[PDB]
């Protein structure tokens, strides 16, 4: 019981850590680059006006 739980739970820990790393290293940087570009282009449209 404990060992079959433990094997299942080990896999669940690995999956959870993989998701945390993806949010921290793939998803958040892509959002922050996108946000910086939008903030930049809005100043360019404002200078054209």
């Amino acid at each position: 019981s404990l060992q079959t739980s433990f094997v299942t739970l080990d896999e669940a820990i690995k999956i959870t850590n993989r998701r945390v790393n993806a949010i921290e290293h793939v998803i958040i940087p892509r959002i922050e680059r996108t946000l910086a570009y939008i903030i930049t282009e809005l100043d360019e449209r404002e200078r054209e006006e």
């Binding site: 850590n17 993989r18 993806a22 290293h25 360019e44 054209e48």
Partner: protein
């Protein structure tokens, strides 16, 4: 023939606004003419005619308009455009950003007076540059080779060692002597000291010409400083037949002064508020390089850039990369890791490398080894980026080979220290040693006839 008719002088200043002074009742104005202004306190300043219309001329004043007035200020018109006196005496001199001496020596006795703006060389008369310069810096020589006559700027940022790299290149350049012409725009005194000290410490100073505009000097001098320097390089190269290396220090100070000048005329803006013509303007500086038909001399340019917020898409590094024949890229992430020189090869390029290397030029492997080192370094970066998500236990042994190559490449091929002077052949064999890690069937940029000759050593 000489200008034998006398100069007119005018008190007819009709208005002043920003960096611009506006004269009226001017007798037959000449566009781009030079004007000398005497202020009420007896201070002299100079300016150039930026517009003409009937009896009016608009002057931009290089030292600024502060303390000019509509009544007592007096302007003398020189009859001519901006020309610089040039002679072979200019090697071993120091000048300010408007070409006046600052070494306590005399003014120049001209061998000629040359138009500061230069003149476009005919594409028929250009010779393609093919003689490789060995800088001895492996990250340049092995993977971005410099031909004698190239434009190849150093893209860097604030706090990085681009001064030290540029000094190492000046100290080590030779074929597999240079005369140096050095311009500074907007430098602090410790930067001005560093170069002048290094050129005197290497004994080289009797073969160096310096133009200095420091951070406290006038801004509008910065837009003539590189044109004074390049006019001196064109006399030395294309009349005195020398090989010239021209260093232009912080072109971002030139571009910032150009933006500040253009913003006062209200010319059409491009990206991030720079002038709409900034590409053309930078191109009039960077195209003043190369070899020509029937003359021995040559001009090589190495402009140095500071990228604002490390952004290579900013108009200054962007429009420079569109004109120049490559770039060397200095990386904050390598500098923070205490590597020297911090040259990240992936954003770097040399265009003239492709024909300056290979059989008879360097060695038969050079074009193959270089491309395979780029491929393994790009893949090593992709595996290091995968590791940050999935952790080491997910990596196969093939991923660990690229991730071992990555560590050994940055320690052996990139890292060098400030006075080490590697041959091309050392750089190539340090190349093969890192490539040897991989089983040969992984080396898919390299043909069988190269692998079977150089990998088994």
């Amino acid at each position: 023939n000489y200008l034998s008719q006398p100069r007119l002088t005018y008190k007819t200043v009709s208005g002043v606004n920003g960096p611009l002074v506006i004269l009226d009742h001017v007798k037959f104005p000449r566009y781009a003419e030079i004007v000398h202004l005497t202020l009420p306190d007896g201070t002299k300043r100079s300016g150039q005619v930026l517009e003409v219309s009937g009896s009016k001329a608009v002057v931009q004043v290089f030292e600024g308009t502060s303390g000019i007035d509509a009544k007592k200020t007096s302007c003398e018109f020189t009859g001519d455009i901006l020309r610089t006196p040039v002679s072979e005496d200019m090697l071993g001199r120091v000048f300010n950003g408007s070409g006046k001496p600052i070494d306590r020596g005399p003014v120049v006795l001209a061998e000629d007076f040359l138009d500061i703006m230069g003149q476009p060389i005919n594409p028929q008369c250009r010779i393609y540059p093919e003689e490789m310069i060995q800088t001895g810096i492996s990250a340049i020589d092995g993977m971005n080779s410099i031909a004698r006559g190239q434009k190849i700027p150093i893209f860097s940022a604030a706090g990085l060692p681009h001064n030290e790299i540029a000094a190492q290149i000046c100290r080590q350049a030779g074929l597999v002597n240079f005369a140096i012409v050095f311009a500074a725009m907007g430098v602090n005194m410790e930067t001005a000291r560093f170069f002048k000290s290094d050129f005197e410490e290497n004994g080289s100073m009797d073969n160096v010409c310096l133009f200095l505009n420091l951070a406290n000097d006038p801004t509008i001098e910065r837009i003539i400083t590189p044109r004074l320097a390049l006019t001196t390089a064109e006399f030395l190269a294309y009349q005195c037949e020398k090989h010239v290396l021209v260093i232009l220090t912080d072109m971002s100070s030139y571009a910032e002064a150009l933006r500040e000048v253009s913003a006062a005329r209200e010319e059409v803006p491009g990206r991030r508020g720079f002038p709409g013509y900034m590409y053309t303007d930078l191109a009039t500086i960077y195209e003043r390089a190369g070899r020509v038909e029937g003359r021995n001399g040559s001009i090589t340019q190495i402009p140095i850039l500071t990228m604002p917020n490390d952004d290579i898409t900013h108009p200054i590094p962007d429009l420079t990369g569109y004109i120049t024949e490559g770039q060397i890229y200095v990386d904050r992430q390598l500098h923070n890791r205490q590597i020297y020189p911090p040259i990240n090869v992936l954003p770097s390029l040399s265009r003239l490398m492709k024909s300056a290397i290979g059989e008879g030029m360097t060695r038969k492997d050079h074009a193959d080894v270089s491309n395979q080192l780029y491929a393994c370094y790009a893949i090593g970066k992709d595996v290091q980026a995968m590791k940050a998500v999935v952790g080491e236990e997910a990596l196969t042994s093939d991923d660990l080979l690229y991730l071992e190559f990555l560590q050994k490449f940055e320690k052996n091929f990139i890292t060098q220290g400030p006075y080490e002077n590697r041959t091309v052949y050392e750089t190539l064999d340090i190349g093969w040693q890192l490539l040897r890690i991989f089983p040969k069937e992984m080396l898919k940029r390299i043909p069988q006839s190269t692998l079977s000759e150089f990998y088994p050593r």
